[PDB]
Amino acid sequence: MEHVAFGSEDIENTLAKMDDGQLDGLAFGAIQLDGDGNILQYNAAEGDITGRDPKQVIGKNFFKDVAPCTDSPEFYGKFKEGVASGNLNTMFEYTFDYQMTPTKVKVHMKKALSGDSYWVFVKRV
Amino acid sequence: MEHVAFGSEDIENTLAKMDDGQLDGLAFGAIQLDGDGNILQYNAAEGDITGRDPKQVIGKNFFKDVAPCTDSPEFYGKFKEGVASGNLNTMFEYTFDYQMTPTKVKVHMKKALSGDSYWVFVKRV
Ligand SMILES: *C(=O)/C=C/c1ccc(O)cc1
Ligand SMILES: *C(=O)/C=C/c1ccc(O)cc1
């Protein structure tokens, strides 16, 4: 495992150094999106929570294709505000329920250090 | 019962001699984790507090699987700091609320004497 806690204040600095395998070592789900919501990275812990295969979702659009239940003011709306403002750091609970048993999670979206990159972190609640 | 008090200054020396049955005799919950948070030992008193079955949780990851509510800077963050520094001795109250009635506890994490081992002690408050 990689010793990083969900919600940590410097998470964007710690995860900037991680390859695919290190991201797969986290205690929580980690998704990286571009500013349009296309999936750039997606770790194994996320697949443990939602059942998706981390290899197959890369390149798909999170809001349009993978996670339409997040296409709402309360999730996508917050994401796109943060993208437009160039700052994003918001945490909230949510339920993931598309083609799956409804699963309540805590979500933390935070702008990455890489250009045009935004993290979506997920854990069970 | 085993005559050891929660928070005692030499608890790591006293619990080094205990088998499963002696650990099960303590007045408080006692979990032993490796440095990644995988569960090595887990006593009966802990199961009385949180409802989990001590045999089934051995080998699971505390922060990723069993106790996601502890995957936070205030619990896991402190744990991993103590692991990285090779010293850990911290006590704090916390609420355990994953798939259970929220239960307020006092937590004491302390490095064990065994290599790559860390105690998490729990009592109700
Ligand atoms: C709602 O449609 C949520 C879908 C979802 C969220 C997170 C994932 O890893 C996969 C699908
Ligand atoms: C939060 O998710 C806490 C969970 C928990 C703590 C302690 C246990 O013995 C079992 C589950």
PDB file of C-alpha atoms and ligand atoms in Angstrom:
ATOM      1  CA  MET A   1       0.000   0.000   0.000  1.00  0.00           C
ATOM      2  CA  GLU A   2       0.964   3.694  -0.335  1.00  0.00           C
ATOM      3  CA  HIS A   3       0.758   5.655   2.923  1.00  0.00           C
ATOM      4  CA  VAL A   4      -1.611   8.460   1.861  1.00  0.00           C
ATOM      5  CA  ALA A   5      -4.911   9.223   3.617  1.00  0.00           C
ATOM      6  CA  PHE A   6      -8.096  10.268   1.899  1.00  0.00           C
ATOM      7  CA  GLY A   7      -8.611  14.028   2.256  1.00  0.00           C
ATOM      8  CA  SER A   8      -5.015  14.796   3.114  1.00  0.00           C
ATOM      9  CA  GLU A   9      -4.128  18.439   2.616  1.00  0.00           C
ATOM     10  CA  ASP A  10      -1.216  17.844   0.224  1.00  0.00           C
ATOM     11  CA  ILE A  11      -2.690  14.872  -1.657  1.00  0.00           C
ATOM     12  CA  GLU A  12      -2.071  16.531  -5.044  1.00  0.00           C
ATOM     13  CA  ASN A  13       1.671  16.752  -4.280  1.00  0.00           C
ATOM     14  CA  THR A  14       1.949  13.159  -3.026  1.00  0.00           C
ATOM     15  CA  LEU A  15       0.058  11.633  -5.943  1.00  0.00           C
ATOM     16  CA  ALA A  16       1.977  13.622  -8.567  1.00  0.00           C
ATOM     17  CA  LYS A  17       4.860  11.063  -8.312  1.00  0.00           C
ATOM     18  CA  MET A  18       2.746   7.900  -8.633  1.00  0.00           C
ATOM     19  CA  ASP A  19       2.731   5.589 -11.631  1.00  0.00           C
ATOM     20  CA  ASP A  20      -0.209   3.283 -12.363  1.00  0.00           C
ATOM     21  CA  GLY A  21       1.065   0.667  -9.920  1.00  0.00           C
ATOM     22  CA  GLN A  22       1.498   3.092  -7.044  1.00  0.00           C
ATOM     23  CA  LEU A  23      -1.969   4.586  -7.612  1.00  0.00           C
ATOM     24  CA  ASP A  24      -3.265   1.013  -7.451  1.00  0.00           C
ATOM     25  CA  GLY A  25      -1.736   0.828  -3.964  1.00  0.00           C
ATOM     26  CA  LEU A  26      -3.944   3.520  -2.415  1.00  0.00           C
ATOM     27  CA  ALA A  27      -6.567   2.873   0.285  1.00  0.00           C
ATOM     28  CA  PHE A  28      -9.144   4.845  -1.722  1.00  0.00           C
ATOM     29  CA  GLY A  29     -10.368   5.171  -5.286  1.00  0.00           C
ATOM     30  CA  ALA A  30      -8.495   7.662  -7.423  1.00  0.00           C
ATOM     31  CA  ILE A  31      -9.660   8.921 -10.823  1.00  0.00           C
ATOM     32  CA  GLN A  32      -7.941  11.599 -12.814  1.00  0.00           C
ATOM     33  CA  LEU A  33     -10.021  13.580 -15.356  1.00  0.00           C
ATOM     34  CA  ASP A  34      -9.174  16.207 -17.924  1.00  0.00           C
ATOM     35  CA  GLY A  35     -11.183  19.432 -17.883  1.00  0.00           C
ATOM     36  CA  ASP A  36     -13.860  17.898 -20.103  1.00  0.00           C
ATOM     37  CA  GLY A  37     -14.275  14.879 -17.819  1.00  0.00           C
ATOM     38  CA  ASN A  38     -12.381  12.333 -19.908  1.00  0.00           C
ATOM     39  CA  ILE A  39     -10.696   9.665 -17.778  1.00  0.00           C
ATOM     40  CA  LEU A  40      -6.885   9.853 -17.768  1.00  0.00           C
ATOM     41  CA  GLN A  41      -6.138   7.549 -14.806  1.00  0.00           C
ATOM     42  CA  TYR A  42      -8.236   5.208 -12.725  1.00  0.00           C
ATOM     43  CA  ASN A  43      -6.953   2.992  -9.992  1.00  0.00           C
ATOM     44  CA  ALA A  44      -7.639  -0.525  -8.759  1.00  0.00           C
ATOM     45  CA  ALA A  45      -9.254   0.641  -5.511  1.00  0.00           C
ATOM     46  CA  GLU A  46     -11.898   2.489  -7.520  1.00  0.00           C
ATOM     47  CA  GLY A  47     -12.721  -0.725  -9.367  1.00  0.00           C
ATOM     48  CA  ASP A  48     -13.087  -2.476  -6.027  1.00  0.00           C
ATOM     49  CA  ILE A  49     -15.771   0.089  -5.057  1.00  0.00           C
ATOM     50  CA  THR A  50     -17.721   0.336  -8.297  1.00  0.00           C
ATOM     51  CA  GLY A  51     -16.884  -2.874 -10.198  1.00  0.00           C
ATOM     52  CA  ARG A  52     -15.506  -1.218 -13.341  1.00  0.00           C
ATOM     53  CA  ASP A  53     -12.321  -2.400 -14.988  1.00  0.00           C
ATOM     54  CA  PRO A  54      -9.643   0.328 -14.655  1.00  0.00           C
ATOM     55  CA  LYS A  55      -8.195  -0.414 -18.096  1.00  0.00           C
ATOM     56  CA  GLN A  56     -11.453  -0.214 -19.997  1.00  0.00           C
ATOM     57  CA  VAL A  57     -12.624   3.150 -18.665  1.00  0.00           C
ATOM     58  CA  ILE A  58      -9.515   5.119 -19.590  1.00  0.00           C
ATOM     59  CA  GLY A  59     -10.413   7.478 -22.392  1.00  0.00           C
ATOM     60  CA  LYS A  60     -14.138   7.383 -21.719  1.00  0.00           C
ATOM     61  CA  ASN A  61     -16.002  10.476 -20.571  1.00  0.00           C
ATOM     62  CA  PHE A  62     -16.958  10.154 -16.899  1.00  0.00           C
ATOM     63  CA  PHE A  63     -20.043  12.400 -17.021  1.00  0.00           C
ATOM     64  CA  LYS A  64     -21.440  11.340 -20.388  1.00  0.00           C
ATOM     65  CA  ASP A  65     -20.602   7.613 -20.533  1.00  0.00           C
ATOM     66  CA  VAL A  66     -19.315   5.971 -17.374  1.00  0.00           C
ATOM     67  CA  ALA A  67     -21.132   7.804 -14.562  1.00  0.00           C
ATOM     68  CA  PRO A  68     -24.316   9.467 -15.807  1.00  0.00           C
ATOM     69  CA  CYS A  69     -25.613   9.540 -12.221  1.00  0.00           C
ATOM     70  CA  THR A  70     -22.934  12.222 -11.591  1.00  0.00           C
ATOM     71  CA  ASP A  71     -24.219  14.380 -14.498  1.00  0.00           C
ATOM     72  CA  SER A  72     -25.990  16.774 -12.121  1.00  0.00           C
ATOM     73  CA  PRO A  73     -25.376  20.196 -10.551  1.00  0.00           C
ATOM     74  CA  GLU A  74     -24.216  18.471  -7.336  1.00  0.00           C
ATOM     75  CA  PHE A  75     -21.291  16.584  -8.928  1.00  0.00           C
ATOM     76  CA  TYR A  76     -20.568  17.563 -12.563  1.00  0.00           C
ATOM     77  CA  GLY A  77     -21.734  21.116 -11.844  1.00  0.00           C
ATOM     78  CA  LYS A  78     -19.180  21.450  -9.034  1.00  0.00           C
ATOM     79  CA  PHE A  79     -16.471  19.845 -11.165  1.00  0.00           C
ATOM     80  CA  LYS A  80     -16.965  22.187 -14.091  1.00  0.00           C
ATOM     81  CA  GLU A  81     -17.064  25.257 -11.838  1.00  0.00           C
ATOM     82  CA  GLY A  82     -13.703  24.241 -10.420  1.00  0.00           C
ATOM     83  CA  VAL A  83     -12.281  23.651 -13.893  1.00  0.00           C
ATOM     84  CA  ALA A  84     -13.480  27.036 -15.115  1.00  0.00           C
ATOM     85  CA  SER A  85     -12.097  28.818 -12.055  1.00  0.00           C
ATOM     86  CA  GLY A  86      -8.826  26.912 -12.240  1.00  0.00           C
ATOM     87  CA  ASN A  87      -9.259  25.973  -8.593  1.00  0.00           C
ATOM     88  CA  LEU A  88     -11.091  22.910  -7.343  1.00  0.00           C
ATOM     89  CA  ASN A  89     -11.195  21.455  -3.837  1.00  0.00           C
ATOM     90  CA  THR A  90     -14.584  20.141  -2.760  1.00  0.00           C
ATOM     91  CA  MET A  91     -15.688  17.129  -0.720  1.00  0.00           C
ATOM     92  CA  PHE A  92     -19.182  15.706  -0.456  1.00  0.00           C
ATOM     93  CA  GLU A  93     -21.068  12.440  -0.090  1.00  0.00           C
ATOM     94  CA  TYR A  94     -22.878  10.964  -3.093  1.00  0.00           C
ATOM     95  CA  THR A  95     -24.574   7.772  -4.226  1.00  0.00           C
ATOM     96  CA  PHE A  96     -23.332   5.830  -7.245  1.00  0.00           C
ATOM     97  CA  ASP A  97     -26.258   3.872  -8.698  1.00  0.00           C
ATOM     98  CA  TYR A  98     -25.842   3.354 -12.469  1.00  0.00           C
ATOM     99  CA  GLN A  99     -26.069  -0.329 -13.389  1.00  0.00           C
ATOM    100  CA  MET A 100     -24.908  -1.258  -9.884  1.00  0.00           C
ATOM    101  CA  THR A 101     -26.158  -1.688  -6.322  1.00  0.00           C
ATOM    102  CA  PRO A 102     -26.510   1.882  -5.003  1.00  0.00           C
ATOM    103  CA  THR A 103     -23.301   2.599  -3.131  1.00  0.00           C
ATOM    104  CA  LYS A 104     -22.842   5.618  -0.883  1.00  0.00           C
ATOM    105  CA  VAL A 105     -19.418   7.230  -1.064  1.00  0.00           C
ATOM    106  CA  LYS A 106     -17.456  10.255   0.038  1.00  0.00           C
ATOM    107  CA  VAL A 107     -16.022  12.123  -2.928  1.00  0.00           C
ATOM    108  CA  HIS A 108     -13.116  14.578  -2.888  1.00  0.00           C
ATOM    109  CA  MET A 109     -12.394  16.484  -6.107  1.00  0.00           C
ATOM    110  CA  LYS A 110      -9.168  18.439  -6.222  1.00  0.00           C
ATOM    111  CA  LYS A 111      -7.203  20.071  -8.977  1.00  0.00           C
ATOM    112  CA  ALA A 112      -4.084  18.116  -9.805  1.00  0.00           C
ATOM    113  CA  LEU A 113      -0.631  19.597 -10.280  1.00  0.00           C
ATOM    114  CA  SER A 114      -0.400  18.364 -13.902  1.00  0.00           C
ATOM    115  CA  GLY A 115      -1.935  20.702 -16.482  1.00  0.00           C
ATOM    116  CA  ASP A 116      -5.609  20.142 -17.376  1.00  0.00           C
ATOM    117  CA  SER A 117      -5.918  17.410 -14.735  1.00  0.00           C
ATOM    118  CA  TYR A 118      -8.397  17.010 -11.893  1.00  0.00           C
ATOM    119  CA  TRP A 119      -8.583  14.285  -9.260  1.00  0.00           C
ATOM    120  CA  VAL A 120     -11.754  12.571  -8.113  1.00  0.00           C
ATOM    121  CA  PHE A 121     -11.095  10.543  -4.955  1.00  0.00           C
ATOM    122  CA  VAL A 122     -13.670   8.101  -3.604  1.00  0.00           C
ATOM    123  CA  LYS A 123     -14.132   6.030  -0.453  1.00  0.00           C
ATOM    124  CA  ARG A 124     -17.044   4.126   1.028  1.00  0.00           C
ATOM    125  CA  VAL A 125     -19.189   5.646   3.760  1.00  0.00           C
TER     126      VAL A 125
ATOM    127  CA  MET B   1      -9.564 -11.102  32.389  1.00  0.00           C
ATOM    128  CA  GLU B   2      -5.976  -9.818  32.025  1.00  0.00           C
ATOM    129  CA  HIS B   3      -5.071  -7.044  34.464  1.00  0.00           C
ATOM    130  CA  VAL B   4      -3.970  -4.346  31.990  1.00  0.00           C
ATOM    131  CA  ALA B   5      -5.489  -0.853  31.833  1.00  0.00           C
ATOM    132  CA  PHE B   6      -6.183   1.100  28.673  1.00  0.00           C
ATOM    133  CA  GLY B   7      -3.484   3.740  28.166  1.00  0.00           C
ATOM    134  CA  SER B   8      -0.968   2.164  30.500  1.00  0.00           C
ATOM    135  CA  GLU B   9       2.569   3.395  29.919  1.00  0.00           C
ATOM    136  CA  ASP B  10       4.117  -0.030  29.330  1.00  0.00           C
ATOM    137  CA  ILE B  11       1.197  -1.631  27.455  1.00  0.00           C
ATOM    138  CA  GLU B  12       3.438  -2.680  24.554  1.00  0.00           C
ATOM    139  CA  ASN B  13       5.611  -4.729  26.939  1.00  0.00           C
ATOM    140  CA  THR B  14       2.654  -6.361  28.708  1.00  0.00           C
ATOM    141  CA  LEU B  15       0.825  -7.337  25.522  1.00  0.00           C
ATOM    142  CA  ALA B  16       3.947  -8.767  23.859  1.00  0.00           C
ATOM    143  CA  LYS B  17       3.464 -12.020  25.868  1.00  0.00           C
ATOM    144  CA  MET B  18      -0.237 -12.559  25.111  1.00  0.00           C
ATOM    145  CA  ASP B  19      -1.671 -15.331  22.957  1.00  0.00           C
ATOM    146  CA  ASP B  20      -5.036 -14.992  21.208  1.00  0.00           C
ATOM    147  CA  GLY B  21      -6.900 -16.095  24.325  1.00  0.00           C
ATOM    148  CA  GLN B  22      -5.100 -13.658  26.601  1.00  0.00           C
ATOM    149  CA  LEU B  23      -5.724 -10.765  24.199  1.00  0.00           C
ATOM    150  CA  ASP B  24      -9.375 -11.844  24.277  1.00  0.00           C
ATOM    151  CA  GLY B  25      -9.265 -11.321  28.048  1.00  0.00           C
ATOM    152  CA  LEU B  26      -8.559  -7.583  27.941  1.00  0.00           C
ATOM    153  CA  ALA B  27     -11.009  -4.925  29.134  1.00  0.00           C
ATOM    154  CA  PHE B  28     -10.559  -2.988  25.882  1.00  0.00           C
ATOM    155  CA  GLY B  29     -10.379  -3.642  22.153  1.00  0.00           C
ATOM    156  CA  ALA B  30      -6.948  -4.478  20.793  1.00  0.00           C
ATOM    157  CA  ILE B  31      -6.045  -4.596  17.105  1.00  0.00           C
ATOM    158  CA  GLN B  32      -2.564  -5.175  15.784  1.00  0.00           C
ATOM    159  CA  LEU B  33      -1.737  -3.844  12.292  1.00  0.00           C
ATOM    160  CA  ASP B  34       1.300  -4.118  10.060  1.00  0.00           C
ATOM    161  CA  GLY B  35       2.753  -0.913   8.658  1.00  0.00           C
ATOM    162  CA  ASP B  36       0.367  -1.014   5.707  1.00  0.00           C
ATOM    163  CA  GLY B  37      -2.675  -1.386   7.976  1.00  0.00           C
ATOM    164  CA  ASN B  38      -3.325  -5.080   7.418  1.00  0.00           C
ATOM    165  CA  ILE B  39      -4.869  -6.749  10.468  1.00  0.00           C
ATOM    166  CA  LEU B  40      -2.571  -9.199  12.266  1.00  0.00           C
ATOM    167  CA  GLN B  41      -4.483  -9.626  15.545  1.00  0.00           C
ATOM    168  CA  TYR B  42      -7.903  -8.554  16.703  1.00  0.00           C
ATOM    169  CA  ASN B  43      -9.458  -9.406  20.035  1.00  0.00           C
ATOM    170  CA  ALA B  44     -12.882 -10.347  21.304  1.00  0.00           C
ATOM    171  CA  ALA B  45     -13.386  -7.087  23.182  1.00  0.00           C
ATOM    172  CA  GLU B  46     -13.059  -5.175  19.912  1.00  0.00           C
ATOM    173  CA  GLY B  47     -15.814  -7.326  18.418  1.00  0.00           C
ATOM    174  CA  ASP B  48     -17.981  -6.479  21.405  1.00  0.00           C
ATOM    175  CA  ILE B  49     -17.574  -2.775  20.560  1.00  0.00           C
ATOM    176  CA  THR B  50     -17.959  -2.832  16.790  1.00  0.00           C
ATOM    177  CA  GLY B  51     -19.746  -6.132  16.044  1.00  0.00           C
ATOM    178  CA  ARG B  52     -17.117  -7.583  13.715  1.00  0.00           C
ATOM    179  CA  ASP B  53     -16.001 -11.189  13.993  1.00  0.00           C
ATOM    180  CA  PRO B  54     -12.344 -11.288  15.115  1.00  0.00           C
ATOM    181  CA  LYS B  55     -11.530 -14.283  12.934  1.00  0.00           C
ATOM    182  CA  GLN B  56     -12.915 -12.892   9.684  1.00  0.00           C
ATOM    183  CA  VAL B  57     -11.093  -9.551   9.800  1.00  0.00           C
ATOM    184  CA  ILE B  58      -7.583 -10.989  10.169  1.00  0.00           C
ATOM    185  CA  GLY B  59      -5.722 -10.360   6.959  1.00  0.00           C
ATOM    186  CA  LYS B  60      -7.997  -7.555   5.774  1.00  0.00           C
ATOM    187  CA  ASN B  61      -6.757  -3.997   5.421  1.00  0.00           C
ATOM    188  CA  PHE B  62      -8.160  -1.820   8.200  1.00  0.00           C
ATOM    189  CA  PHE B  63      -8.072   1.496   6.287  1.00  0.00           C
ATOM    190  CA  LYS B  64      -9.156   0.253   2.870  1.00  0.00           C
ATOM    191  CA  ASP B  65     -11.675  -2.507   3.719  1.00  0.00           C
ATOM    192  CA  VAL B  66     -12.810  -2.838   7.311  1.00  0.00           C
ATOM    193  CA  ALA B  67     -12.791   0.754   8.604  1.00  0.00           C
ATOM    194  CA  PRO B  68     -13.052   3.279   5.764  1.00  0.00           C
ATOM    195  CA  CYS B  69     -14.320   5.887   8.241  1.00  0.00           C
ATOM    196  CA  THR B  70     -10.741   5.876   9.652  1.00  0.00           C
ATOM    197  CA  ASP B  71      -9.251   6.604   6.195  1.00  0.00           C
ATOM    198  CA  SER B  72      -8.712  10.276   7.038  1.00  0.00           C
ATOM    199  CA  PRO B  73      -5.844  12.556   8.166  1.00  0.00           C
ATOM    200  CA  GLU B  74      -7.129  12.304  11.772  1.00  0.00           C
ATOM    201  CA  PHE B  75      -6.732   8.512  12.067  1.00  0.00           C
ATOM    202  CA  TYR B  76      -4.927   6.862   9.107  1.00  0.00           C
ATOM    203  CA  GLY B  77      -2.811  10.002   8.635  1.00  0.00           C
ATOM    204  CA  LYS B  78      -1.573   9.792  12.226  1.00  0.00           C
ATOM    205  CA  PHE B  79      -1.000   6.043  11.897  1.00  0.00           C
ATOM    206  CA  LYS B  80       1.115   6.337   8.784  1.00  0.00           C
ATOM    207  CA  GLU B  81       3.149   9.219  10.203  1.00  0.00           C
ATOM    208  CA  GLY B  82       3.960   7.047  13.193  1.00  0.00           C
ATOM    209  CA  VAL B  83       4.891   4.112  10.956  1.00  0.00           C
ATOM    210  CA  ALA B  84       7.156   6.237   8.766  1.00  0.00           C
ATOM    211  CA  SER B  85       8.884   7.753  11.803  1.00  0.00           C
ATOM    212  CA  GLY B  86       9.253   4.381  13.514  1.00  0.00           C
ATOM    213  CA  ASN B  87       7.600   5.877  16.583  1.00  0.00           C
ATOM    214  CA  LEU B  88       3.881   5.973  17.291  1.00  0.00           C
ATOM    215  CA  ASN B  89       2.064   6.847  20.508  1.00  0.00           C
ATOM    216  CA  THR B  90      -1.086   8.889  20.055  1.00  0.00           C
ATOM    217  CA  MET B  91      -4.489   8.880  21.746  1.00  0.00           C
ATOM    218  CA  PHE B  92      -7.654  10.566  20.531  1.00  0.00           C
ATOM    219  CA  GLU B  93     -11.405  10.144  20.471  1.00  0.00           C
ATOM    220  CA  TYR B  94     -13.136   9.132  17.232  1.00  0.00           C
ATOM    221  CA  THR B  95     -16.506   7.924  15.945  1.00  0.00           C
ATOM    222  CA  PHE B  96     -16.847   4.569  14.212  1.00  0.00           C
ATOM    223  CA  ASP B  97     -19.840   4.747  11.860  1.00  0.00           C
ATOM    224  CA  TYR B  98     -19.395   2.405   8.882  1.00  0.00           C
ATOM    225  CA  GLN B  99     -22.359   0.033   8.533  1.00  0.00           C
ATOM    226  CA  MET B 100     -23.035   0.358  12.272  1.00  0.00           C
ATOM    227  CA  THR B 101     -24.687   2.646  14.829  1.00  0.00           C
ATOM    228  CA  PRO B 102     -22.226   5.526  15.260  1.00  0.00           C
ATOM    229  CA  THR B 103     -20.118   4.638  18.292  1.00  0.00           C
ATOM    230  CA  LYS B 104     -17.801   7.108  19.987  1.00  0.00           C
ATOM    231  CA  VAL B 105     -14.547   5.610  21.232  1.00  0.00           C
ATOM    232  CA  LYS B 106     -11.166   6.529  22.636  1.00  0.00           C
ATOM    233  CA  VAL B 107      -8.338   5.237  20.440  1.00  0.00           C
ATOM    234  CA  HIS B 108      -4.727   4.687  21.473  1.00  0.00           C
ATOM    235  CA  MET B 109      -2.252   3.772  18.733  1.00  0.00           C
ATOM    236  CA  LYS B 110       1.169   2.650  19.879  1.00  0.00           C
ATOM    237  CA  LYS B 111       4.049   0.937  18.174  1.00  0.00           C
ATOM    238  CA  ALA B 112       4.377  -2.677  19.212  1.00  0.00           C
ATOM    239  CA  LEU B 113       7.622  -4.409  20.166  1.00  0.00           C
ATOM    240  CA  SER B 114       7.282  -6.976  17.352  1.00  0.00           C
ATOM    241  CA  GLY B 115       8.748  -5.854  14.033  1.00  0.00           C
ATOM    242  CA  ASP B 116       6.389  -4.084  11.607  1.00  0.00           C
ATOM    243  CA  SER B 117       3.566  -4.146  14.171  1.00  0.00           C
ATOM    244  CA  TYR B 118       1.384  -1.350  15.536  1.00  0.00           C
ATOM    245  CA  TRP B 119      -1.355  -1.547  18.152  1.00  0.00           C
ATOM    246  CA  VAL B 120      -4.724   0.179  17.908  1.00  0.00           C
ATOM    247  CA  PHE B 121      -6.516   0.064  21.273  1.00  0.00           C
ATOM    248  CA  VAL B 122     -10.169   1.029  21.585  1.00  0.00           C
ATOM    249  CA  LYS B 123     -12.624   1.653  24.440  1.00  0.00           C
ATOM    250  CA  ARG B 124     -16.037   3.235  24.608  1.00  0.00           C
ATOM    251  CA  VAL B 125     -16.499   6.821  25.754  1.00  0.00           C
TER     252      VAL B 125
HETATM  253  C1  LIG C   1     -23.264   7.034 -11.496  1.00  0.00           C
HETATM  254  O1  LIG C   1     -23.655   6.876 -12.641  1.00  0.00           O
HETATM  255  C2  LIG C   1     -21.932   6.641 -10.985  1.00  0.00           C
HETATM  256  C3  LIG C   1     -21.194   5.847 -11.743  1.00  0.00           C
HETATM  257  C4  LIG C   1     -19.775   5.442 -11.440  1.00  0.00           C
HETATM  258  C5  LIG C   1     -19.058   6.127 -10.492  1.00  0.00           C
HETATM  259  C6  LIG C   1     -17.764   5.776 -10.253  1.00  0.00           C
HETATM  260  C7  LIG C   1     -17.163   4.779 -10.976  1.00  0.00           C
HETATM  261  O2  LIG C   1     -15.889   4.342 -10.660  1.00  0.00           O
HETATM  262  C8  LIG C   1     -17.864   4.117 -11.958  1.00  0.00           C
HETATM  263  C9  LIG C   1     -19.166   4.466 -12.222  1.00  0.00           C
HETATM  264  C1  LIG C   2     -15.138   3.186  10.369  1.00  0.00           C
HETATM  265  O1  LIG C   2     -15.323   2.851   9.215  1.00  0.00           O
HETATM  266  C2  LIG C   2     -14.787   2.317  11.508  1.00  0.00           C
HETATM  267  C3  LIG C   2     -14.896   1.019  11.331  1.00  0.00           C
HETATM  268  C4  LIG C   2     -14.471  -0.030  12.319  1.00  0.00           C
HETATM  269  C5  LIG C   2     -13.661   0.283  13.387  1.00  0.00           C
HETATM  270  C6  LIG C   2     -13.259  -0.663  14.273  1.00  0.00           C
HETATM  271  C7  LIG C   2     -13.609  -1.962  14.066  1.00  0.00           C
HETATM  272  O2  LIG C   2     -13.281  -2.927  15.008  1.00  0.00           O
HETATM  273  C8  LIG C   2     -14.369  -2.314  12.977  1.00  0.00           C
HETATM  274  C9  LIG C   2     -14.785  -1.354  12.072  1.00  0.00           C
END
